[PDB]
Write a protein that binds this ligand. Structure first.
Ligand SMILES: Nc1ncnc2c1ncn2[C@@H]1O[C@H](COP(=O)(O)OP(=O)(O)OP(=O)(O)O)[C@@H](O)[C@H]1O
Length: 318
């Protein structure tokens, strides 16, 4: 029996989509699924962690990535999502650098690094309708993102001509994903990425891959200009259908390989006849889609079998 180890925080490992997917992987004749207990992950040394032949491990808040890396180095399992890349995914500056290296379209942007050791350094000049970052001008509207990919406090600054002020985005609190603020001045402390605001039709596209050749997309209302979350007549968040075009299917292929995360998600902005990526989230499942659960589990089980059946002298064709 090939053992597939699942290593993440309990919030993730016990989520409905995870359980749905692991149920289906368990249907593979030669695969056994072992889910690492969060108490073991946090409290036990990696030498006591359960063995596996294939590891699916991913960082989220509170997760000890150093320990996951140490475990994989100790046991040498087949790794589905590369662990070292998961440090980089936490830093938006590292993300944009990789996308640029891969020739992936993204908004024009500039990084503002604020060193607390150097108070006499200034690389941002603010005007009424623009900012100058490292000498480069961004006219309003522009977007201001914390360099930490885990900090969802993204602000959008409106031009005088539209009423000024700003939209402050945040991790969804129930009925809301953003709020308007009369504040027109940018944040005075911290490091930020500034980028051009891309006009879309009011929706954001979310793409979810299972390896480079499978990508499911769906859209939702953008929190950019209105912060009210749309809900079903039943009560679920409203999603819109998306089919990726050939250029976008290629983007998905590139993002998956560049960041070395088999199961991963990223965002697309459809603007000016093109598609821009400027958020890469790593390990992500689609929720509430039985077809996705079916396909995801099949792809993952097939990947495991293809890689490992030879070692275990298990019959497996193509
Ligand atoms: N350059 C841009 N132009 C237009 N809209 C943007 C731009 N950058 C981000 N947005 C809007 O801001 C929202 C939040 O930005 P982004 O997704 O980068 O932040 P995040 O905090 O990483 O969100 P999450 O990880 O939950 O998907 C996007 O979904 C999109 O609606």
């Amino acid at each position: 029996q090939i053992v597939v180890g699942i290593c993440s925080m309990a919030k993730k490992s016990k989520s409905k989509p995870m359980k749905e997917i692991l149920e289906r992987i368990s249907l593979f004749k030669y695969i056994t699924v072992v889910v690492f207990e969060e108490e073991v992950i946090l409290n036990e040394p990696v030498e006591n962690w359960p063995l596996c032949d294939c590891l699916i491990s991913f960082h989220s808040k509170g997760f000890p990535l150093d320990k996951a890396v140490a475990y994989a180095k100790l046991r040498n399992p087949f790794v589905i999502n590369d662990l070292n890349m998961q440090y980089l995914i936490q830093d938006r500056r590292e993300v944009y650098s990789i996308l640029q290296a891969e020739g992936i379209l993204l908004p024009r942007y500039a990084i503002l690094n604020r060193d607390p050791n150097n108070p006499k350094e200034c690389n941002l000049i603010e005007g009424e309708d623009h900012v100058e970052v490292n000498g480069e001008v961004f006219q309003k509207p522009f977007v201001e993102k914390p360099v930490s990919a885990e900090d969802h406090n993204v602000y959008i600054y409106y031009p005088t001509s539209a009423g000024g002020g700003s939209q402050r985005l945040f991790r969804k609190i129930g009925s809301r994903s953003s709020v308007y603020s009369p504040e027109s001045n940018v944040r005075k402390t911290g490091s930020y990425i500034y980028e051009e605001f891309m006009p879309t039709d009011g929706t954001d596209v979310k793409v979810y891959t299972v390896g480079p050749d499978y990508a499911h997309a769906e859209a939702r209302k953008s929190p950019a200009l209105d912060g009210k979350v749309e809900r079903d007549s039943e009560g679920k968040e409203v999603r819109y259908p998306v089919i990726l075009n050939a250029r976008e299917k290629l983007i998905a292929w590139k993002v998956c390989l560049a960041f070395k995360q088999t199961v991963c998600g990223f965002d697309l902005l459809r603007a000016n006849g093109q598609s821009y990526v400027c958020d890469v989230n790593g390990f992500s499942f689609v929720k509430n889609s039985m077809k996705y659960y079916d396909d995801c589990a099949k792809i993952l089980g097939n990947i495991v079998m293809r890689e490992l059946a030879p070692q275990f002298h298990i019959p497996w064709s193509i």
